[PDB]
Amino acid sequence: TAKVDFLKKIEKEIQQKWDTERVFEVNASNLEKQTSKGKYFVTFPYPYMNGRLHLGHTFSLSKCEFAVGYQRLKGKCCLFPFGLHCTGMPIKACADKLKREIELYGCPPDFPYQWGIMKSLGLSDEEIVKFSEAEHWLDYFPPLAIQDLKRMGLKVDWRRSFITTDVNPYYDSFVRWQFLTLRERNKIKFGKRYTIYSPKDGQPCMDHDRQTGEGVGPQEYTLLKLKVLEPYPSKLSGLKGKNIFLVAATLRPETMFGQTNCWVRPDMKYIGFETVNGDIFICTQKAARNMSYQGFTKDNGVVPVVKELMGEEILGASLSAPLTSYKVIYVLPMLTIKEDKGTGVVTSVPSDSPDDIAALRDLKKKQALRAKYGIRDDMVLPFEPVPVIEIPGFGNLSAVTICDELKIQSQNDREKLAEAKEKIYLKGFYEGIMLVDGFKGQKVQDVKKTIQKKMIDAGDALIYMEPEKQVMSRSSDECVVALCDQWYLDYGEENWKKQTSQCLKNLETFCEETRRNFEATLGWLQEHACSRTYGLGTHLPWDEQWLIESLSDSTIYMAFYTVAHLLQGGNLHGQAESPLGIRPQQMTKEVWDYVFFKEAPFPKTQIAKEKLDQLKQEFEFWYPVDLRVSGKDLVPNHLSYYLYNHVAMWPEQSDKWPTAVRANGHLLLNSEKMSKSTGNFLTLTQAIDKFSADGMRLALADAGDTVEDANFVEAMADAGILRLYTWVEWVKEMVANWDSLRSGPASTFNDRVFASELNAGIIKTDQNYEKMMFKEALKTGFFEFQAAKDKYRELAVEGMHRELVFRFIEVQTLLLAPFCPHLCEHIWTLLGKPDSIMNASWPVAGPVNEVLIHSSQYLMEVTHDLRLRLKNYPSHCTIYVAKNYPPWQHTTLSVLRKHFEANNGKLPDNKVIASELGSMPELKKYMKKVMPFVAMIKENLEKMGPRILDLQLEFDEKAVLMENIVYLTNSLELEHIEVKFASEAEDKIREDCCPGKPLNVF
């Protein structure tokens, strides 16, 4: 426990030092004068302030944090700014839900929650009251976010942080300029469109104010109206004189020429309600709610219910249906009717629907159902399926034939009916051919929309939009599809979409899966409602009654990063003075144009030219955004709008469009989903408290660098804490015994091996950092680096060479620094370095001798085999080393070499190999030993490349063993080791010993 506390002490000290030194505050005015090696602008999408940042946020931002930590060592000047997103309604929603209990009860509220979660967050009793207003949320959470992030140690120029609502005047002016420019270029449009809608919230329910189905949109349905004929059913007797329609949803209108009846569920609760023209529709309550928000009722959302009833009360009723050949069709019962899809009212097309003929034959079989539900023989018997569409592999009555084939006799055979439904599922969309007059011999795909229009024009059908999948909102309201008027961004325009597609071609997506996501969400995308009325944020500058949603004021704010340090300077709300002395409202549309558009004219403004020139310098220098890292959830919405709006704001400058986007997975904790409800949860401040800034950052580097779910494992973080502590102890020990280390020329075999391994580690780790495989960089640059140092220490019999030890410490500290900058800064100062490690440069790697490394691996294997053989049957040991392969081994290896040379390095099958080696008469006495030899060669070939096909080792085997005979004798606890050239060996050993695999007898 004391080790984590030691790490925390080091981190706090070093953080204060960094803060005072103002190391991570970059200014384009100064950095544009010294052309170093280019700028590096990274962004992490600013997180919502409806709470405290948790370990997933930290994992996602660690990507660009490690990126800048690496790129600064390579000479780039970096900009890693960090804003905070307060736009949206959850803050206001939970603040008003709080004021609800504050007013309707007391402090604390008497029950029979929002007050409960606030007290869970550990707040005092008399301080949750202040959270009734949203302004207090905005004053409370963003400071704690900044505090936690600084306590982590991010390389952020905090002078550029900001807030996103209209509480910030500067960011509000920025959003105003953006949306004025968008409306000036016909990007915003007012219109009445279909959209997923929250009745409780009274505004469209986009993706970030949702709770189920984060990408679901509306789905269209043809709503048939079947006129109820007199004599009306009993329960509708009070509705005589009015027109009553059973409304049924379908997706195949072209089939309505073959209606035999209408199915209702006898046990479902149906509602007959008055529509806008005074007619009466019989559907269900959810269907009627959707219709009420799609203009079907006189008032929006108001459903005037005039008759509740059950399906059994509707049974037997006579109907008039469109297109069908039967003048009167009846309402019949169907047991298997979902209450989630449509209106609860289905039509009977028994020729091309298996369920329909199933239920019809069930009613036709026995008297049981017809009597249990009151269906006389007039309502079932004279009704036969009508040939309407022919599928070539089935016939006119496709469903009839495939249900006679699958031998179905009940409407409850879920398995057989599902199979039959899938068997003709899409063979009717295309291969179906119409048969009715006016369409005889027409491709069904070429006529279905015309038939739907025919019914709509005749007033016999309407358009019913329904959520394709159930969508719950933050306010726990079930969403509908509303045809409502709003301001929308026209992401559907072909020119805009093609230009953003070209922008996606140039964009760097670190894998093809992310690009596929982008292309799919680019094709599918269309009109996007951006206007809200309830929530926080910035109002449309011309329609002050509409607020801009969170996913629409967040598309180009990266440009505001470049100027925020001079506009508002650190003050999150922008309420303090301006360092350049620019008034908040002094920023006009033309002023912003001049700041961000290169060929924009300097407009009439009381601002001096130097201030605007400095802002324009900052923007032109830092842009474009080199990298934006995010969880993959933001690809289908925020990042696509990001590309769109960048194309829209700078349509002439592709050099200002985003460069790279990197998506990662969502963070698991201990291999489980990170949810407070399961107790498997860690906030950033808690994670720091538990593992220090450096141990959690280490375990986060190891969490995952693919798009698959990342995994933060706490045990690995504890092990890394232990290893970091012992590493600091070892560096201290080495600095203490500076003079106890061997000096002079670094010449020994071990010195050379270790120097080569160190340079190889540098090269591997640099490559891993370029690829942003941070887990792989941690593997090669820490665990394997430490393995090389531990081996060098274990084998250095004459003590480790001082200069090599301190080169290793320096380089290891440089390689670990982007992951654990506090520990590495502490060790940097412990080495007596003048400057901070944040001024160091990437370590130069010397030469890498592959032969040295291969000989060290050979020595490892030899020692391992010696210790394994020591397990059984001393004091003296004799090792025999083969200079060449014995005759039979040499012959078989030559054959393998021939076959490898023959076909670009593919060894044939062991079948053919054993055939050829049996054809060679010299191998008679050895055919049993031959194929295990081939197997060993193939294994080590796949393991360590083709170098094992060499007829002689690249290094002196005996000399390698001799450079460490002393270590071998000391480790094996023996008194002497005799290394001999295997020609002195007896018959058995001389014949079996081959190079690289020395034999030995104790």
Ligand SMILES: CC(C)C[C@H](N)C(=O)NS(=O)(=O)OC[C@H]1O[C@@H](n2cnc3c(N)ncnc32)[C@H](O)[C@@H]1O
């Ligand atoms: C620009 C604007 C439209 C963005 C909007 N304000 C917003 O999304 N705010 S946020 O707090 O929900 O996320 C911000 C970043 O953090 C990632 N992330 C979030 N949770 C996890 C998790 N459990 N595991 C891994 N990564 C996560 C997430 O993808 C995103 O890149």
